[PDB]
Amino acid sequence: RFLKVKNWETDVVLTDTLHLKSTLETGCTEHICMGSIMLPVRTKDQLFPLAKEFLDQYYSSIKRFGSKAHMDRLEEVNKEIESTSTYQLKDTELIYGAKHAWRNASRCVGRIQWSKLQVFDARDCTTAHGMFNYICNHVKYATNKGNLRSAITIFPQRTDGKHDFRVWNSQLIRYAGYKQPDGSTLGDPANVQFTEICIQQGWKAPRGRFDVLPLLLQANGNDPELFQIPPELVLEVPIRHPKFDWFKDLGLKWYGLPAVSNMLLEIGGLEFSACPFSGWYMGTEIGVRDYCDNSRYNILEEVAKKMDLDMRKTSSLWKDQALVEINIAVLYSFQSDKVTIVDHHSATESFIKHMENEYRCRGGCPADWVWIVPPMSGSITPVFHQEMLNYRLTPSFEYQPDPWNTHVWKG
Amino acid sequence: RFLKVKNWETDVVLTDTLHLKSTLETGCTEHICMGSIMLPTKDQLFPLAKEFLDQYYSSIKRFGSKAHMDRLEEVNKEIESTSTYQLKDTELIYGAKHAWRNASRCVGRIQWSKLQVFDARDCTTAHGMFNYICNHVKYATNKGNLRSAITIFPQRTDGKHDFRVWNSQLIRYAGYKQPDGSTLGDPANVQFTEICIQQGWKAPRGRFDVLPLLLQANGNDPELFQIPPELVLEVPIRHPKFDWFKDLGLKWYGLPAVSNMLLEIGGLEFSACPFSGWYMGTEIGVRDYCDNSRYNILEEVAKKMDLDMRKTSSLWKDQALVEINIAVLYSFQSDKVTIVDHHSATESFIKHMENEYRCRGGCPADWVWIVPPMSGSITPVFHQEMLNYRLTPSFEYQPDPWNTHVW
Ligand code: HEM
Ligand code: HEM
Numbered sequence A: 001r002f003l004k005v006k007n008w009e010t011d012v013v014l015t016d017t018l019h020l021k022s023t024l025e026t027g028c029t030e031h032i033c034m035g036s037i038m039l040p041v042r043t044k045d046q047l048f049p050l051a052k053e054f055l056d057q058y059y060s061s062i063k064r065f066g067s068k069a070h071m072d073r074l075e076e077v078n079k080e081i082e083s084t085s086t087y088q089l090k091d092t093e094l095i096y097g098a099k100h101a102w103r104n105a106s107r108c109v110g111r112i113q114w115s116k117l118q119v120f121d122a123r124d125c126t127t128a129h130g131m132f133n134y135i136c137n138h139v140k141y142a143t144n145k146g147n148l149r150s151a152i153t154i155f156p157q158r159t160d161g162k163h164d165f166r167v168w169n170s171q172l173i174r175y176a177g178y179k180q181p182d183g184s185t186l187g188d189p190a191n192v193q194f195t196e197i198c199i200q201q202g203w204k205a206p207r208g209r210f211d212v213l214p215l216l217l218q219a220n221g222n223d224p225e226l227f228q229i230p231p232e233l234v235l236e237v238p239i240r241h242p243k244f245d246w247f248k249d250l251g252l253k254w255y256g257l258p259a260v261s262n263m264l265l266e267i268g269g270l271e272f273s274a275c276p277f278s279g280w281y282m283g284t285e286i287g288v289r290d291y292c293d294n295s296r297y298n299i300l301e302e303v304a305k306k307m308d309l310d311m312r313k314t315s316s317l318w319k320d321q322a323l324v325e326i327n328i329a330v331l332y333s334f335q336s337d338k339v340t341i342v343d344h345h346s347a348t349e350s351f352i353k354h355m356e357n358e359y360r361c362r363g364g365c366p367a368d369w370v371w372i373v374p375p376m377s378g379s380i381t382p383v384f385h386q387e388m389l390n391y392r393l394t395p396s397f398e399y400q401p402d403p404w405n406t407h408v409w410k411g
Numbered sequence B: 001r002f003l004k005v006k007n008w009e010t011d012v013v014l015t016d017t018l019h020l021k022s023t024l025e026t027g028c029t030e031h032i033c034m035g036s037i038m039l040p041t042k043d044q045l046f047p048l049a050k051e052f053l054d055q056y057y058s059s060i061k062r063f064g065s066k067a068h069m070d071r072l073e074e075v076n077k078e079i080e081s082t083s084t085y086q087l088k089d090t091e092l093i094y095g096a097k098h099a100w101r102n103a104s105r106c107v108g109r110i111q112w113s114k115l116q117v118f119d120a121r122d123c124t125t126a127h128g129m130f131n132y133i134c135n136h137v138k139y140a141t142n143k144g145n146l147r148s149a150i151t152i153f154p155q156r157t158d159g160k161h162d163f164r165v166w167n168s169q170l171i172r173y174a175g176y177k178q179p180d181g182s183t184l185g186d187p188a189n190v191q192f193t194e195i196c197i198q199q200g201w202k203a204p205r206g207r208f209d210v211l212p213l214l215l216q217a218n219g220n221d222p223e224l225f226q227i228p229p230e231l232v233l234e235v236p237i238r239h240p241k242f243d244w245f246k247d248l249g250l251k252w253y254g255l256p257a258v259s260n261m262l263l264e265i266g267g268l269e270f271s272a273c274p275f276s277g278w279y280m281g282t283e284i285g286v287r288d289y290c291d292n293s294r295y296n297i298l299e300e301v302a303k304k305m306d307l308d309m310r311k312t313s314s315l316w317k318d319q320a321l322v323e324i325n326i327a328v329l330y331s332f333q334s335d336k337v338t339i340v341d342h343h344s345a346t347e348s349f350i351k352h353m354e355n356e357y358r359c360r361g362g363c364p365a366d367w368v369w370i371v372p373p374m375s376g377s378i379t380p381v382f383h384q385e386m387l388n389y390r391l392t393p394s395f396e397y398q399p400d401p402w403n404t405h406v407w
């Protein structure tokens, strides 16, 4: 089967054969599309086929398919599964797996960078303290004084699912949220619940607007423990605007390092439940969503006020106007402090080039349009006009339920 | 089977049960989602007729009544005898309104039941079609206080006798390739303009030349008519602050009127069924003006604004995009021509969704199309999960007739 995707801006038509290697499900059927739905303990039995698939891929990527080294490694993994019910990945296979999960991440506009990924192997980690040390080294290395480098840290795989490693935080760096008695929130509304858990776990909340939350870490199925990331390791950029000098008086800042820490890395059937990964921000992630979502810092009002826009009718597009300046501000602030960041035009242009390349070299690029198109100025970015095919390839990054819903407390 | 949709801005979770009536296919499988692709007999007809008539008589609180069964019989008799059948006016009205109700890409459906339907099933020639269309345009324009409408020409019979409007909208600006390499007017109609020229159009070779209608009655070769200029309401585009905006000399038409689609009611196919409502501002300002394949005026507007076009990171495209869109909305409101902003339109559609979940058990919605093409995440539809599925009656796309026709 061949599938064609067309670009309506340029009339370029590409052909997807890669979707034939797709295993997992989409959520969709012939009768329903779930493309806009946010979220649409293995036996030896299901495991070896998955192991075989991965190693055949691995071994094709290094040009050694059907080699003695390939067949030997197959035999080796076979025996290891039937003996221990699992297996261990060589370092090289871990690295390749991690790179490919990113590459396969259909909702990531940033994948032109997929091959430049520093993989830290934290598979020898046994304790929360160990996890905290690994995570600090990751932050420091990834930050690199503002010259951000992509990285991921891979803690030990699931075994019985009773001994899971987990970073309770959704991202390694995030600001606290405090729901107040009057129903207002101080700080980041997205993070209220997690903030409460942390408080419960004994964190002394500063109760400010931009309190970096403590890491909350579980090793080996144990109850999790709190650690404050050293402040010096947390690079932050104060937000100012190039023309509007009152923009600084809003007191805004953000952190430099986007680092997702709640996802599950699946490689060759193995499940890595703690695998924090980081890159660098696209400006709209902070300036549209983090500041201007209604259920977030929600500063459109205050900014429109200060610009003295006409706020009596939405047809003044006052919101659209405030939104753009806020985003100009984020990009200006990051660049000024020499903290890596990419604007939404640049990021989506790169991504189209990546995708084109991927269709030639690889025969596809699974892509989720709902997520790839930016949350402002959609159609003046080249991705709006690009037909995409969404399908799931392994290795992959998967969502997993928040651990406080499932965790069995030791006490 | 029962399906939940969550709004991530409000936590409201609605349960969709209406998709279980889903008739047609989506393009997707369990293996591949095609959510972002633009275009994924007598025996056949009685089920489709019955399905429709069942929902009709159910809509009017008379499911399984003599009148219901009698009509089911009558149509059954007529199909077996004639190989087609005819809708009662009431069925036509209900059908048309529901094709709109079921259009999963339309953000404007809160309005679906206020649709004026013009039964044009007695039309027999292109001149007739032209008369009906002019009357549509006039009724719907309504001196700028625009009103939704559809005009339904006769149904397909043997497909050798289709009625078609070759225009994609009733009202569009022409497009001409220039020896200068560049394109004069609207580049999305260049081919249609050559077919018009080719069929004898006297093009005035300007930038905003209202194209002529090209009408096909009874599968015959289509003919040309110029909509009375006096019936094509236009709006010159000015900005409430930038006085130099006028000098780009942009105008846009008031009436969005989709003419190229096929309407399916109870198995019957109406190939010429132009319909119209009114614009959401971004269709003109973001898409018609700023798309690279369209009038593409961003570069020129940003220059007059004297913004830094040296680097994409100054967001100069975005700054210019907003003003262009302020200017569209401003010029329409000033000339008193109905237009809706994307905030208002999406806010309306969320209220509609809730109504449709409550009163119908769902609302098929295609997020890719529902979320405006600018400022997506500050409109509420961005955070709203949607389920997209195909219900009948429906508007379907259909191939441009120049490819299908024989002369
Ligand atoms: C290097 C710079 C990077 C940029 C600019 C980039 C950009 C993006 C953006 C804009 C999104 C959508 C985020 C949202 O709106 O919430 C995204 C999602 C994603 N990215 Fe990338 N990314 C980068 C690096 C990476 C790296 C290094 C990985 C993994 C190694 C990755 C994996 C993903 C995954 C798994 C998602 C989806 C997360 C989810 O569904 O919650 N990203 N990225
Ligand atoms: C009354 C004011 C109306 C508003 C503000 C409205 C708004 C919209 C918008 C924003 C789109 C997406 C179009 C694009 O991006 O080009 C749309 C598409 C659509 N609308 Fe509505 N609409 C209205 C009236 C109607 C009426 C009266 C009908 C049918 C009788 C209808 C049927 C559709 C269909 C079938 C599509 C998609 C057709 C396609 O795939 O091109 N619209 N409309």
Ligand SMILES: Cc1cc(N)nc(CCc2ccc(CCCN)c(CCc3cc(C)cc(N)n3)c2)c1
Binding pocket: A038, A039, A110, A171, A258, A259, A260, A277, A278, A279, A280, A281, A282, A285, A289, A290, A399
């Ligand atoms: C590594 C990386 C780099 C980069 N530039 N961006 C990212 C995306 C990070 C990210 C941050 C925050 C969020 C939460 C939304 C707030 N904006 C997300 C989406 C997380 C998410 C939430 C839900 C409900 C489901 C899901 N699959 N994923 C994803 C990762």
Ligand SMILES: Cc1cc(N)nc(CCc2ccc(CCCN)c(CCc3cc(C)cc(N)n3)c2)c1
Binding pocket: B038, B039, B188, B256, B257, B258, B275, B276, B277, B278, B279, B280, B283, B397
């Ligand atoms: C009735 C109505 C009201 C309103 N406010 N807006 C509309 C949408 C009209 C419209 C305008 C422009 C366009 C495209 C312009 C680019 N050449 C379209 C739809 C075009 C289309 C193309 C294809 C390939 C498929 C499809 N289903 N629809 C539809 C209708």
Ligand SMILES: C[C@H](O)[C@H](O)[C@H]1CNc2nc(N)[nH]c(=O)c2N1
Binding pocket: A008, A384, A385, A386, A387, A388, B036, B037, B038, B368, B369, B370, B371
């Ligand atoms: C390729 C992609 O599906 C295409 O650009 C779509 C995206 N969303 C859209 N949304 C609307 N409302 N109108 C459109 O024409 C499109 N185009």
Ligand SMILES: C[C@H](O)[C@H](O)[C@H]1CNc2nc(N)[nH]c(=O)c2N1
Binding pocket: A035, A036, A037, A038, A370, A371, A372, B008, B382, B383, B384, B385, B386
């Ligand atoms: C319901 C809908 O899928 C949801 O709002 C999605 C839309 N697109 C998105 N796109 C990105 N990049 N990040 C998001 O959180 C979302 N949210």
Ligand SMILES: [Zn+2]
Binding pocket: A028, A032, A033, A034, A035, B028, B029, B032, B033, B034, B035
């Ligand atoms: Zn789908």
